[PDB]
Amino acid sequence: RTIGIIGAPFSKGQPRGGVEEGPTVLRKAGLLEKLKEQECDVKDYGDLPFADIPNDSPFQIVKNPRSVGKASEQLAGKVAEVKKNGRISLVLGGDHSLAIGSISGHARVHPDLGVIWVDAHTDINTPLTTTSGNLHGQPVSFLLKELKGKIPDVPGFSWVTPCISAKDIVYIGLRDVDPGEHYILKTLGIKYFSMTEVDRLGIGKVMEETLSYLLGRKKRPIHLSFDVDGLDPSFTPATGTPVVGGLTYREGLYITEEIYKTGLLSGLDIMEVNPSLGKTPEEVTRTVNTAVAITLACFGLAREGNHKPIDYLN
Amino acid sequence: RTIGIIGAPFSKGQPRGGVEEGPTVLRKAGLLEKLKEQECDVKDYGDLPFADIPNDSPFQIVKNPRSVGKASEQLAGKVAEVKKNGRISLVLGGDHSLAIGSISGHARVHPDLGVIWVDAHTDINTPLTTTSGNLHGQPVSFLLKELKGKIPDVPGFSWVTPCISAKDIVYIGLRDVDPGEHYILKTLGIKYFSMTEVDRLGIGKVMEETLSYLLGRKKRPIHLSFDVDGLDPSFTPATGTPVVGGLTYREGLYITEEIYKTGLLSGLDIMEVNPSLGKTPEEVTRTVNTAVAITLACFGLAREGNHKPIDYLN
Amino acid sequence: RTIGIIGAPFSKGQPRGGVEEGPTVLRKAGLLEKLKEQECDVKDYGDLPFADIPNDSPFQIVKNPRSVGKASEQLAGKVAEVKKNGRISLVLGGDHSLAIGSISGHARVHPDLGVIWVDAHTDINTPLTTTSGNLHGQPVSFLLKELKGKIPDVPGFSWVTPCISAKDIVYIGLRDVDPGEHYILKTLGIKYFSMTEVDRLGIGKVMEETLSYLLGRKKRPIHLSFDVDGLDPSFTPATGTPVVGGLTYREGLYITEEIYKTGLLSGLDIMEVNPSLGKTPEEVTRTVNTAVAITLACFGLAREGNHKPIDYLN
Ligand SMILES: [Mn+2]
Ligand SMILES: [Mn+2]
Ligand SMILES: [Mn+2]
Ligand SMILES: [Mn+2]
Ligand SMILES: [Mn+2]
Ligand SMILES: [Mn+2]
């Protein structure tokens, strides 16, 4: 499939530092090389350089808003470009706040997109319901047309225009949702498979109804925003907000294998890999390796195997 | 939901000491506080004080029978009271022998109850089939009307009257069942989902058929007796009789979330947490944390999230 | 069930040494004793002695072919004998190359056999598609009638006659398949449940369709060739070629419990246990213990429990 890689070494959507190193440790792992060893056409659009914004005091409770805002604005511009170049955007994070710009720029070029949000969290707090103020826990609230009217003018986000409606997104992996978030969920009627539903139905049925839900009326570009804390920390420990009882390694590969097979993946986020937070070097490689695997599955790597259209018996 | 907490610091239904500390480490973990942070009405009926019975030689093979007998008698009285106070009894164990008194006192007030027994073991040995003599491996045999006639008069249990028939109980998680126990199982036609059935059907279908089985003729109070060794030891290692290939963290939360949603939970046992047996401090907290999670799920904590009937967009 | 145990302490189908010790560590674990403690009739046909073949240079890329060839020839003779003695052959490996002789000798006596191949790998490289040259990655290619014509005359395998057609085998657990192998898979239309299919359907449905597929036209002897790397390395780490995201402990017991219940198991391979490769003594026992469990399940040990046709209430 044909890919446009974008490094997004940004961390100020949350408090812990090393998330900005994600694009580095992923590239170090040979992500680009392994993509090419596959059926892949790969163009690297570099690491965005996110100039410091030293004057950035909180807005109400909301932390680093100018910094988060500009980084998303920057990224949105860069995503629209690779989408215009006919390529699937691959955003290497970075904290999940970047999704505001990733999904924003994607939809500039493909407004009909649907979003699959794999995450232990809904990340839909508004600047009024957040308790922490960390913007990586708010991106969805900025993107939703229905929450227009409840999102104050925060410095650095004036460029934003809600691009997705409640019925255009599906959540998978939820297990730590705030009350205001849950209210928003039920109130806007958003489609979700929490860990309970995954337990109930099986990841097979979950993907079936996810894809049917989003693609049923008709085929559309898909945006996969993947928070590695959606997966159990026994798989992705080096991450800021881990929550036990997550998606397994297998379920994570199942999700992305099935998304690959639609042929509709148009944009991908690989978010929240924080090498500084593994308590061992092995925790770091375990996380990075898992994140590479998930990424490769998005672009055709299949556990049953892969072969080119040649005769191998020769 | 509205709860009556009962500490049951008792261990002589089995040989290893620290099970008596379960109510302590659970309370230490903030169980009561977290319950209240939920939708919960919580009354603490204290830790029962179980006076020593120093003269208590075996009855045949059966170990500490007067001690086990009186502790269950004591607890039964205390459970009936909280049930009379209109509250769900929460028994913090303690070894599983206590279930004799827990289910006994429950049924004093609600004789129509049905029992869900989550456990790697059937705990249905009789004083004649047990090999070990440990009474925590016999509670079900004392409660079953059908085994009346096969249960010798053991000192300390004269107060007992079988209160549940074979068709009123379901087992979930079985993976170490003795031969005599298996005989009893097939012979009395008891309903069970062993790990094999959980593997086959999925915990979703298991709960569906469990609840249908017990509630189908008509709605009834449910008694959940939860042996933490039902869950894999990678989740609940600090426990006396661990058996590999158990229920997952997720399956354990699935079970209790579904039991919560019936609105019929009337009595709960949280049993066999033994902090002395974790090989590390982290094994101890891992166990305790898991046991708190399972407990909170029984009383409404949902992985998809929870909110109060207020408008959160304000 | 009635069993014929064969030790096969052979390693030259792959490069790492200690696989030859598998029959030793399994016997050490009390495999024979535990079999007998079950409903089992057990005859030990000893450890085959595999005389050195010091002159054995590669054939093309193919490594140790005379050694691998003779060991399989030897074993095939020994398997046919126990099959003639009316016993289920239990081959204790040893590397998976031995399957050439195991399935070869089995089919001498029961040509209608069907094969269940539990493995992370398809082990179907031919001497022309292998990259490594290790014969433990080629046994299936030697056994398949359809690949007759693509398998050069390799020294030490002149005795071989393909005994199974593509439609007579099922794979379960696949997650590291080469391109040429995948080509062969699709091209010969071989039935497989890769980890993706296991994720999709559940191991319940997988076994249902596996057994239906193979037994549907009519009942037949089953050959189970079990590579312990089919199971996740968190279960079977001491093994040469581990691949993450494998079959669970539970799924492994599910498979063999269901195979047992057909009453048709006629031959079994327990392969690739390498005690030298555990990074701890506990990794070694964890592997060996898992391998014993899987083995016992093949012969009737059930997680729901087992009892003899006697009255246990006495
Ligand atoms: Mn998250
Ligand atoms: Mn997130
Ligand atoms: Mn138990
Ligand atoms: Mn128990
Ligand atoms: Mn293998
Ligand atoms: Mn193999």
Side-chain angles (χ1 to χ4, degrees), chain B residues 150-173:
Chain B
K150 302 259 17 128
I151 276 93
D153 303 321
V154 185
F157 298 84
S158 71
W159 57 277
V160 165
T161 288
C163 52
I164 57 140
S165 135
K167 80 219 192 294
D168 291 333
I169 176 155
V170 180
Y171 281 115
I172 300 175

Side-chain angles (χ1 to χ4, degrees), chain B residues 148-313:
Chain B
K148 213 163 53 260
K150 302 259 17 128
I151 276 93
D153 303 321
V154 185
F157 298 84
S158 71
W159 57 277
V160 165
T161 288
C163 52
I164 57 140
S165 135
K167 80 219 192 294
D168 291 333
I169 176 155
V170 180
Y171 281 115
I172 300 175
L174 302 180
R175 48 189 193 290
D176 186 4
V177 178
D178 290 336
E181 291 186 289
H182 196 242
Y183 177 81
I184 296 185
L185 257 206
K186 300 257 116 211
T187 289
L188 288 194
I190 295 171
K191 191 48 169 339
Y192 62 92
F193 304 86
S194 84
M195 288 317 294
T196 306
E197 287 62 62
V198 178
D199 286 340
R200 185 182 288 107
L201 295 174
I203 199 52
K205 203 42 215 114
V206 156
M207 292 302 304
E208 197 184 41
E209 328 191 348
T210 282
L211 291 179
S212 185
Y213 179 79
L214 279 184
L215 293 182
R217 256 290 179 204
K218 75 227 129 233
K219 273 355 186 211
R220 28 128 52 116
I222 297 183
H223 189 108
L224 172 52
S225 201
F226 205 112
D227 183 342
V228 301
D229 66 33
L231 296 193
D232 197 75
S234 59
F235 297 120
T236 43
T239 197
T241 51
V243 191
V244 306
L247 289 165
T248 64
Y249 196 91
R250 279 163 54 182
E251 285 163 338
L253 287 184
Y254 188 78
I255 288 248
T256 49
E257 287 174 337
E258 283 302 301
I259 286 319
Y260 167 71
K261 287 165 67 204
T262 56
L264 296 172
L265 177 73
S266 17
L268 184 54
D269 303 326
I270 295 290
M271 311 307 277
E272 295 288 354
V273 171
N274 188 338
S276 297
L277 299 180
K279 337 139 197 284
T280 63
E282 180 275 342
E283 276 194 17
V284 179
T285 71
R286 182 187 334 159
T287 302
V288 177
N289 285 340
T290 290
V292 166
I294 279 344
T295 294
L296 296 188
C298 290
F299 295 114
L301 210 265
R303 287 171 284 174
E304 68 162 65
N306 296 67
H307 65 98
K308 352 278 179 74
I310 54 164
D311 173 1
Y312 287 80
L313 276 177

Side-chain angles (χ1 to χ4, degrees), chain A residues 310-314, chain C residues 128-129 150 183:
Chain A
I310 54 164
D311 173 1
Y312 287 80
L313 276 177
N314 267 213
Chain C
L128 310 185
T129 63
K150 302 259 17 128
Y183 177 81

